[PDB]
Amino acid sequence: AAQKSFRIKQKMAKAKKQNRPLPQWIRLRTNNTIRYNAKRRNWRRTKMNI
Amino acid sequence: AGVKAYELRTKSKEQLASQLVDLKKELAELKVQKLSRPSLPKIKTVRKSIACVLTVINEQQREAVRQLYKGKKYQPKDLRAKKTRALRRALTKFEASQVTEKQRKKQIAFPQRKYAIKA
Amino acid sequence: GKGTPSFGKRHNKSHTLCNRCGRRSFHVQKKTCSSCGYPAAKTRSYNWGAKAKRRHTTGTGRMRYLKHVSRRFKNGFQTGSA
Amino acid sequence: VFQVSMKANKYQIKKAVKELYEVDVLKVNTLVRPNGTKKAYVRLTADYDALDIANRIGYI
RNA sequence: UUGACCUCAAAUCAGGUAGGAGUACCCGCUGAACUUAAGCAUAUCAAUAAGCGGAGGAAAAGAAACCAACCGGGAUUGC
RNA sequence: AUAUUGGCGAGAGACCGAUAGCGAACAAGUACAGUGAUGGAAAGAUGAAAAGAACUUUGAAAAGAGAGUGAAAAAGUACGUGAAAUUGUUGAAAGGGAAGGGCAUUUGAUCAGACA
RNA sequence: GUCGAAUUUGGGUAUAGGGGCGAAAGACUAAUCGAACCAUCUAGUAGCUGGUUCCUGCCGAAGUUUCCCUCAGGAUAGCAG
RNA sequence: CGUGGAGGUCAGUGACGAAGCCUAGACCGUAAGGUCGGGUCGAACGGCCUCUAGUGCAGAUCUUGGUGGUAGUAGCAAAUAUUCAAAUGAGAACUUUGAAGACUGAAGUGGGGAAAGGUUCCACGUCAACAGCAGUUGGACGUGGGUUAGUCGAUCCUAAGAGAUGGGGAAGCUCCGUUUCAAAGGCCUGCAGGCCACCAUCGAAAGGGAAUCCGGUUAAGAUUCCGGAACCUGGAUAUGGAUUCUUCACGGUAACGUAACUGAAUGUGGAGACGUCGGCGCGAGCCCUGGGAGGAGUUAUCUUUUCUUCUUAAC
RNA sequence: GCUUGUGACGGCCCGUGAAAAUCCACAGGAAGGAAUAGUUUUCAUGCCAGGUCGUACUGAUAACCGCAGCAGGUCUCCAAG
RNA sequence: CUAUCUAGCGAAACCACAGCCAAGGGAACGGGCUUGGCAGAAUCAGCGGGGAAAGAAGACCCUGUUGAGCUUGACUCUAGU
RNA sequence: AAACUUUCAACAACGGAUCUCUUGGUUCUCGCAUCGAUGAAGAACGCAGCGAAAUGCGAUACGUAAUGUGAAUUGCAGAAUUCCGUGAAUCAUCGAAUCUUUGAACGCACAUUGCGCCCCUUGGUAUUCCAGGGGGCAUGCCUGUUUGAGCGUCAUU
Ligand SMILES: [Zn+2]
């Protein structure tokens, strides 16, 4: 919020890295079951609660 | 492959420090190369080499300290056995076997005997 | 008056993050975590909250030290090496 | 421009730079990027060429 | 003046220890009501659940200020 | 000697078998909700093996049509089987403010059963 | 309607459930208030409402007595098997 | 009669096709149901004597899931309003550019921010999904980039107030109190000297608060970057200047004045530090406006005309 | 003239309209001080450093809460003719 | 501006099956039943009589050997004093 | 007669029932006793060549060392300095180390990546200032050590 805790910003980078799709080389792994990330987040729809 | 601790354990503190410095330098250069090129897994080996070097150095100091406190009353807390807390307290073999003198006399006079029932 | 327009007056977090429970449960004005109980030394637990007990109790995490204890006990708390 | 540990500070950074690269540092600016890293802008003195040292380092 | 004693203090003194976790079982403490009574207040649920303290690998109890009244038995615990 | 839904390591069952059985057979106390305490999911199956459809053609492309692999594509990542409600096409048939049904029979379509 | 005071308001702070606050309406207390929210006891109990899964055969009722803080229910006798 | 499962038995059936499903094809049974034929499908299953049970649904405003008529219906109607042409692209009511008209009309549909949000900001690519039409566009999707401080804030101070300590109550998690019935230390000169003391701590991105402005710059950043010019704090220090033989300055009647011009504990005082309303004066900015110097606009006619630049920070 | 700041005044009150950190001054007279020189760092000049975290963007008829790109609600500064 | 017609999009309540009436009888007001009147596809915009229309396990009433709030010289206790 | 409505079959659709399967659950019996200030459980953050998570680890970061096996891993590339070797593997085992910031949590605090003090050492002229590095600074209780107060109290100068 333009004057924000560093703890907060730490978590921001965390979420920024956690918001992405799968690398696709995993889908070719032997005996995989993971086609798409199930834990993604978009700011429009759902929130973090920080 | 890379380096081996059995080759390093014959070396000294100074040679090891130089080795470590060289490894960190090389690692820095490899990080530069990693963005020049798509992928660079030679960096893993030097990363693990650093770990092995630090392990050996730590071992040297630790064993030096151990032989320094060889057979002393108070050893350092990071050098005592860890066994578990309740044991690090609990009685010793000595203290457990401590016995009053009355009980000593009764034990010696009348210990349990070996006997058998046939005839 | 109390619903949809009133709920627009909500921008004052009554709770922050704990350093202990990591939850958005640290009350500010009260300075307590209604899940961890920090800054009390006792962990907050209640029998009637058994679901809650097992949401947090050992098993729920990494067990950085403990997981190796059965190995050590099985060995008999070894010393040295081969 | 450099990526730096979060526990760092300008003094340490300055020091380490002259150490590693044999340079006179004019000044330093820092920031914490949104990606959870420390970006470090570092001005040199006029006695040096940031460019020459960059391709000395092998990034260019 | 000097030297003791008693008491109480200090010290980042030397060395030690307690905290918290877990808590199926265990020793305690505190402690209800729905309920049942075809109502309900005693009573019951219950000396329970909830709440608090503290342990172990088992605990606790245990070598009789006992059971008895028989011709007497003989630590404790459990079936 | 006794207690033990906890912890660890074993071994078993006239148990449940993916709407069951622990809430969870899968990145489940996860996702998600709630200021908060707390609440709390759904979600299994190609094939022996991806051999996961080379190439051609139409199209902007998705895709289709081909071709082709494979035991099978009536196994083509919406994939084991693949039900019903429900819907499309085809075919047959009826129909004046319901439909459906019992007895009886015509008419129509279909069908078994007897001998050397 | 009021619009310069008993004004309006942000932010911080205090007050917590038989408790709080209340220029008093039983009003407000996170869309919840003649007793908040969450979990538990708890599957609380319920003479009351609803529901209660396959066939055939054989038999075949009662709504009346007596007592009950008993009258939408029970026990008992009777009918039935 | 039938379902799940168990013991036993048919030296039971079966990949040359098990169960499962469909079948206005057939057969048996009063019936519960059983059997057969065809199609599909692909790995286990049945008959009989017994045993065992979480054992047979149309209902419970039952539970979970799914699909329907309603129905291509209701309806997508506030916030004055759009239109032409090009480019793009497969494709343009809606993208871009351009041109017209129009609005908000500064109490703005502008510009900036606190709370909150968290990368949405920016670039490229990109339309399967969202944007209740559309979609070449996007706060979308995909990948990357981007947030620079001695001077801004936090950091410090304390307010309402919370909250340790000594202590006391409490079986107890804990409760009370924060000039507390406490043996509560640090100030200068290893030590001798010497003076003081209600001494936790937290509590304001609006209160108090040391100090920075300009011009430029990016796709996206700037009082943070660049160029230039300042300031403050802290610490080092050395040259100058000043003062002294009357050692610790002189002038002014005084108000006071100066480039400096000793001054410990200790004490006193001040600034921090402060309501609101009224009108009056002063200044800054803005508004209006005159001449002159540039540029643009109108110019059938008129208009010595309409508009616009003429600025100067902190220190 | 508008916005604004500001000064001195006046009215108002049973209301007289925070605190502390912090800086400075004064009273004081401890102490230490010149001549071959000695004293002074609130005058000037001169050298070095100045850490940590925040800094993008919106702030709303699309970035906040209202299950949503909801005609709602959300505190504030500038404000031309 | 709507409704209306069109391009595109695209729900919902409700739904035993359904949808022409009279009289009778009936749980004493039937869409169905009995006797009669009648009866021709598919329908469109409106329309607001009926569908004892939907909304909601009636808030009035009675019951329940179900409660709660409040009161009180009710029964029984109680912190306090 | 079409359409439309309705029924039946086929084929295709919606949907995921049924059947078969099952690295799961549940229940029972056995056996054992091992958390933690020598810093736990738990939390947050970050770590891979190419990862979002799960999993594992902690700046030595899907791990280091030692031991055993004895030549893999695997989605791609890279390796192979080997493959009769003190030597592959996400192997197993595990006794030696690392063990971010926290957490009972221990310098003080904690919506702060906030502000101090002691020792040693290093740079800047530096005992005094700044910075870096290294190590330390909780409370209560016990045992004792040293220093200490009290006309509490003894003996003598
Ligand atoms: Zn917390």
Instruction: Dump the DSSP string for chain D.
Output: -EEE-TT--HHHHHHHHHHHH---EEEEEEEE-TTS-EEEEEEEPTTS-HHHHHHHHT--
Q: Which residues contact A35 (CB under 8 A, 6 or more apart)?
A: A22, A27
Token reading at A30:
């032997």
Rounded Cα gap, residues B52 and B54, in angstroms: 5
Half-sphere exposure of B59 (CA within 13 A, CB side): 14
Distance from C-alpha of D13 to C-alpha of D2, rounded to nearest angstrom: 10
The response to whether C79 counts as a known ligand-binding position is no
Alpha-carbon gap, residue B8 to A18, rounded angstroms = 41
Q: Which amino acid is at A23?
A: P
3-state secondary structure of B117: coil
Q: Which residue among B81, B84, B87 places its CB closest to the CB of C79?
A: B81
Q: Which of B30, B11, B25 is nearest to B3 (CA)?
A: B11
| Residues C79 and C72: beta-carbon distance below 8 Å | no
Q: Is the CB of C23 under 7 A from strand F?
A: yes
- Matching residue, tokens 């490894």: B23
Chain K nucleotides close to protein (CB under 7 A) are 23, 33-46, 48-53, 56-68, 74-78, 80-82, 86-88, 93-98, 100, 102-105, 110-113, 131-133
Whole-angstrom CA distances from A42 to A20, A35, A48, B97, C17 are: 10, 19, 9, 69, 21
Tell me which method was used to determine the 3D structure. cryo-EM
C51 SS3 class: helix
Residues ≥6 apart with Cβ < 8 Å to C73: none
Length of chain C: 82
Distance CA D11, CA D17 (A): 10
CB of C42 within 7 Å of some strand G atom? no
Q: Say what the resolution is, in angstroms.
A: 5.3
- Cβ(A13)–Cβ(A28) below 8 Å: no
* End-to-end Cα distance, chain B: 76
Q: What is the token pair recorded at B14?
A: 């100074």
Q: How far is ligand 1, taken at its centre, from the CA of residue C45, in Å?
A: 13
Q: How far apart are CA C28 and CA D8, in angstroms?
A: 31
3 state DSSP class of A50 = coil
3-class SS of residue C68: helix
Pairing status of strand D2-4 against strand D38-44: antiparallel
CA to C1' distance (Å), from A37 to F87: 35
Output the six-digit token pair for B53.
Answer: 């070097």
Neighbours of C48 (CB within 10 A): 7
CA separation for the pair D60, D52 (Å, rounded): 9
Cis peptide before B41 (omega within 30 of 0): no
Measured between beta carbons, the chain D residues lying within 8 angstroms of A6 are 32
CB D40 within 8 A of CB D30: yes
